[PDB]
């Protein structure tokens, strides 16, 4: 629940596919799946979440960008 576990879990998923130093659509998908499937129900589709989360115009949703979703995960 805490952030500490979020980091671990995050890496556990980021390490799944590709470098764990960079998140991916498919990667996040899984996470968003177990991590927070309710967020998937939101009006923000994957693509939207992918593009939305990714604001560093790179392609990686590093933990940094993750803190952005933490907002929606807070509400």
| Residue with Cβ nearer La ion (19 or 58) | 58
CB 72 within 8 A of CB 65: no
State the nearest-atom distance from the C-beta of 50 to La ion, in Å.
11
Give residues in contact with La ion (CB under 5 A): 56, 58, 60
Please say which residue, 35 or 53, places its beta carbon nearer to La ion: 53
65 annotated among ligand-binding-site residues: yes
Binding positions for Ca(2+) are 22, 27, 54, 56, 58, 60, 65
């Amino acid at each position: 629940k805490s952030p500490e576990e979020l980091k671990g879990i995050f890496e556990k998923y980021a390490a799944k596919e590709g470098d764990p130093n960079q998140l991916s659509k498919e990667e996040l998908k899984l996470l968003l799946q177990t991590e927070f499937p309710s967020l998937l129900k939101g009006m923000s589709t994957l693509d939207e979440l992918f593009e939305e989360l990714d604001k560093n115009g790179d392609g990686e949703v590093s933990f940094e960008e993750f803190q952005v979703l933490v907002k929606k995960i807070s509400q």
